[PDB]
Amino acid sequence: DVFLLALGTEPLNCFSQTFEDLTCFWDEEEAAPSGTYQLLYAYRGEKPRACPLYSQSVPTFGTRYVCQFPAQDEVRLFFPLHLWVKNVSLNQTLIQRVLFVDSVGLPAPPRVIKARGGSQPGELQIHWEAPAPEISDFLRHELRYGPTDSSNATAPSVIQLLSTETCCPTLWMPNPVPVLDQPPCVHPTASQPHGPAPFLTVKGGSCLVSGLQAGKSYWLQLRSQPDGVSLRGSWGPWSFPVTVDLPGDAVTIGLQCFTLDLKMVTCQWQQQDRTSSQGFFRHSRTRCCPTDRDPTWEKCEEEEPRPGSQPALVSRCHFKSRNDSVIHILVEVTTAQGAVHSYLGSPFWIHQAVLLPTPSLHWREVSSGRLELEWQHQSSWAAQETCYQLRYTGEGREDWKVLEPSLGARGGTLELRPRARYSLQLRARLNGPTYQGPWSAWSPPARVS
Amino acid sequence: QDVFLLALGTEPLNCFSQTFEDLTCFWDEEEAAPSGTYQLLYAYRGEKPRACPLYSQSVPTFGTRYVCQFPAQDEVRLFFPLHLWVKNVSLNQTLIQRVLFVDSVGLPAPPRVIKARGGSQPGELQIHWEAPAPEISDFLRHELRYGPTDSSNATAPSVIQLLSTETCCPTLWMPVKGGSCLVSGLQAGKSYWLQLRSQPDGVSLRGSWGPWSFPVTVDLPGDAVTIGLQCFTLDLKMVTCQWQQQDRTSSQGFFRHSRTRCCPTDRDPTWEKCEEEEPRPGSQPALVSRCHFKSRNDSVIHILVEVTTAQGAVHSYLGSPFWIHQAVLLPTPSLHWREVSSGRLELEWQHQSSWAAQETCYQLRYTGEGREDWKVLEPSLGARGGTLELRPRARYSLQLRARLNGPTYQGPWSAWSPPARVS
Amino acid sequence: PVAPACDPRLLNKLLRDSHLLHSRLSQCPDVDPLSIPVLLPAVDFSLGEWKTQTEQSKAQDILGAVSLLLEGVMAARGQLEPSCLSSLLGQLSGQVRLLLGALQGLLGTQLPLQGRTTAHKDPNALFLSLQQLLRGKVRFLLLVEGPTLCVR
Ligand SMILES: *[C@@H]1O[C@H](CO)[C@@H](O[C@@H]2O[C@H](CO)[C@@H](O[C@@H]3O[C@H](CO)[C@@H](O)[C@H](O)[C@@H]3O)[C@H](O)[C@H]2NC(C)=O)[C@H](O)[C@H]1NC(C)=O
Ligand SMILES: *[C@@H]1O[C@H](CO)[C@@H](O[C@@H]2O[C@H](CO)[C@@H](O[C@@H]3O[C@H](CO)[C@@H](O)[C@H](O)[C@@H]3O)[C@H](O)[C@H]2NC(C)=O)[C@H](O)[C@H]1NC(C)=O
Ligand SMILES: *[C@@H]1O[C@H](CO)[C@@H](O)[C@H](O)[C@H]1NC(C)=O
Ligand SMILES: *[C@@H]1O[C@H](CO)[C@@H](O)[C@H](O)[C@H]1NC(C)=O
Ligand SMILES: *[C@@H]1O[C@H](CO)[C@@H](O)[C@H](O)[C@H]1NC(C)=O
Ligand SMILES: *[C@@H]1O[C@H](CO)[C@@H](O)[C@H](O)[C@H]1NC(C)=O
Ligand SMILES: *[C@H]1O[C@H](CO)[C@@H](O)[C@H](O)[C@@H]1O
Ligand SMILES: *[C@H]1O[C@H](CO)[C@@H](O)[C@H](O)[C@@H]1O
């Protein structure tokens, strides 16, 4: 309720919501018959005039009297307004106040709040339409959020919203009747809609809250205050709660994705009994305030040549890539009872995901028990800068010797007991600053000695 | 370009104004005529008509045009309707009629006295201009085009809008009203030409783009990495920098620092003189220069160096900017080692300068007796030396280097420690 | 402390609302001349005189221009019978009454005198005159001189 928030520390309180309307009220514990009160008003240099008062019973605070000012010309922002409350028969000014309407604004909370999981696990994209569009240029905004499973917690975690490269408090959001083919982050910019001749559109705002823990439901609330530069006022009431279910971090299913050739990306994730899953992907150039449309996704294609190997624990999938932008990925799992869940993978550049295949491990003994290590020359564009890693142990042993040479280095060298049995294994990552590839799968172990 | 060709537009009896205290109207005709045949009459709303003194010019391969500029004898009022009639005097017939608001036509002149310089960091272009007519200077928007002078012709010149930001100021007072703006992303070391033009802002005064200015050549300084500039600071109070020498040349360096990225001044940047080392004690060959000056920890540092040839020409080079914590020249570490067994040793550090040593990024290498095959390690941020292995009691030696990469600081690579025989 | 008119978003809002209100005149069925003419302010000015007039004179003249516009608009509303056109003129009176208060919040109350006047009869002149005054002397004053007025 709005009336509660306007009372403050004054005997007589008014508030304007659109800055072209006005209502004023005062409270007393007692009650009186009709005609016993008048809320006289006048702006500087006028004959006094009467507000069309009406009365309302509120036993919580006795009796409350309310008037609504004629919106035509009786509300003026920057001129001083005199207010007199008196019993007409007794004719004594019980309450007197002088008010500038620009200083008591109570803005309505945004309507048609829509929200969805953002670009990353824990991102929360909010899109809202502002009531009273003509004043939305002059408003601050505040957000609450808290988990559904924390009724005991006095933790709204209020946060204030302000303009950044990733937050847009106000935008002339594009289209009443959009089509999904529209490029991301399109808005009329300097070509603001010139009324109903182009599309007269919601004049809303949308931006991402960050840092939430993923994979569970949140309730959300939004409110506003005039920023006080030229229009001043107090915080308005909150909007009605809306609930958003964030996707979980794909790390919980062991999602791994990579490319071996800079043109095709392979993804894999685990599975559960009585469950099935499918994969998705997308690309986007830059972070910017999203449009209202839900993110587009494209299906991934299964690896299986029908091999019969049956590694039943994992699903593996592939799709052709591009290197113009960061890549996003998504995975959904379906239960036996038909329910579905969503998991969102961490974004990466393609060059941060290059998993060059297992290396051409090569070795040559300088002497019995001392050998150099190297690689059979191939894939020089990547092999020349990748970060090899290796381990080795003796016959039947489980004690590990380890080596990690410099970026793009040869296999280096190793030592061992002369003519004693040994074996080694290696893996690599494209860590040379030309690329940023992740750990590739280990090569097969080889009894190099 | 020429103003008449931009004015020509799409309507008979064209008009234009360059300062909104002037007005010129003209029209082109297919066939010439003797003098006195036509007259230009005008009248601001609610006034009796008067005549404009015309004159004529030949049009290249198109004919002849009659032109009048509104005489200085009367004032030009902007937001005030103006009627224009051109009369055939022999017939007293109106040939073209137009209704005009002086604020509705405009071709603002390009800014005169353009000057430009190398910016604060490589690839930046400083631009300074004085308004050609200062009263309207705030009611205008400008756009900028530039291209390389070699005419390599990979592409036609790019154009950007000069919108007001923290860095670019379409309007400023200067000790004469004008503006300044900073443009970035240009290719360093190569010379550029520059052009500017402006249009009325479309809210108070309305019109279109005026003519481009004359091209001004700007010699952007090169990125100093091409001459091997490297600067470092052992401690916050002093900065040392060095750059590669050239045989037939002499050179000197200078420095500057700032807290902010405001619109730049008219006057050239006031560098502070860096001071050289003792040369003869330092290096008789002097294959690479060196310089030092006192520093601070409150600001970003910019450094510029210049070189002169034995022929007498001069070239300038601009170094990359850095925060002081990105430039910490931590000295060589106190490398420490201890063998857990013969041929297997842990590595650590002799405790000192913990305020920096506790988070720095060590790096090391080692090899055996008479060998040139390098073993390497790279542990985590602030880590101890870790461990290494070798043949029992065999000869080995090691060396290390470090950078202050722990997110408490952002320092660059320091020089290597001396190689030391540990086995 | 700081005057309300010194926020540029306020002037931009005034301009947008004025141009929206002017365009809306095309929608309602018909417009006919006012039976008795209406007095509107002197919006015309030359850049030659504007650069030499004293700042106090500019403020004193612009306040009177807005006041005379308001007086004309109130007379027009008094003359016209209840209809859509009268509602549009009321809504425009709202714009003018906002503008006058915004200007008084910065320039202070200073004794205005009338300039030259034109007794218009087309009801479109009031929207047009408001828009001309807003684009002209108002924004001219608030941009050329503004930063020196707004501090204290
Ligand atoms: C972006 O990704 C594409 C592929 O997704 C990369 O294209 C690759 O470019 C290299 C170098 O040009 C190609 O190698 C060359 O192949 C030709 C035969 O087509 C051969 O004659 C050359 O000697 C050389 O080996 C490679 O084939 C090509 N890959 C594909 C799948 O077309 C591209 O380099 C990446 N970056 C950019 C900036 O495009
Ligand atoms: C900006 O740089 C100055 C140096 O130019 C920093 O001054 C540093 O101030 C601290 C105390 O505030 C000094 O710490 C002292 O160090 C001695 C050993 O040198 C120790 O025995 C004392 O107990 C005390 O810890 C420090 O020496 C001094 N210089 C350096 C290089 O750290 C100043 O701190 C810097 N700015 C800020 C905001 O820290
Ligand atoms: C009403 O109160 C006013 C203010 O004190 C006083 O001047 C006036 O005489 C009283 N009576 C009437 C009838 O106005
Ligand atoms: C109860 O409080 C705990 C904090 O100790 C919180 O983690 C939990 O979600 C709350 N549960 C409910 C139902 O309020
Ligand atoms: C030309 O004709 C107009 C009427 O169309 C008339 O008013 C005007 O006086 C004539 N010109 C002269 C010089 O008399
Ligand atoms: C080619 O160079 C000339 C200057 O010699 C220039 O006028 C022209 O625009 C250039 N064309 C392209 C496509 O760069
Ligand atoms: C490769 O894999 C290891 C885990 O085995 C990661 O911790 C590391 O960051 C890299 O991605
Ligand atoms: C230290 O020095 C190396 C070159 O030897 C750089 O590539 C590295 O980025 C760091 O600045």
Author numbering:
A (entry chain B): 27 to 475
B (entry chain A): 26 to 200, 228 to 475
C (entry chain C): 23 to 174
Manuscript excerpt for this entry:
Thrombopoietin (Tpo) is a hematopoietic cytokine that is essential for the maintenance of hematopoietic stem cells and the regulation of megakaryocyte and platelet production. Tpo functions by binding its receptor (TpoR, a homodimeric Class I cytokine receptor) and initiating cell proliferation or differentiation. All cytokine receptors contain a cytokine-binding homology region (CHR) in their extracellular domain, composed of a pair of fibronectin type-III (FnIII) domains responsible for recognising the cytokine. TpoR is unusual in that it has tandem CHR domains.
Here, we present the cryo-EM structure of murine Tpo bound to the ectodomain of TpoR at a nominal resolution of 3.6 Å. To stabilise the 1:2 complex, we again used the Leucine zippered ectodomain (TpoR1-482-LeuZ). As there was no significant effect of the C-terminal domain of Tpo in any of our assays, we used only the 4-helix bundle (TpoN) for structural studies. The structure shows that Tpo binds to the membrane-distal CHRs to induce receptor dimerisation whilst the geometry of the membrane-proximal CHR is such that the two receptor chains are in contact at the membrane. The membrane-distal CHR formed by D1 and D2 contains the cytokine-binding site that is formed by loops at the hinge region between the Fn(III) domains. This site on each chain interacts with opposite sides of the cytokine (site I and site II). The high-affinity Site I interface is centred around a cluster of hydrophobic residues presented by both receptor and cytokine. In one receptor chain, a large insertion, unique to TpoR, forms a partially structured loop that contacts cytokine. Despite the poor resolution, it appears that D4 contributes to homodimerization through a D4:D4 interface with an estimated buried surface area of approximately 110 Å2 per chain (PISA41). There was clear density for three N-linked glycosylation modifications in both chains at N117, N178, and N349, and additional density at Cδ of W465 consistent with mannosylation at this site.
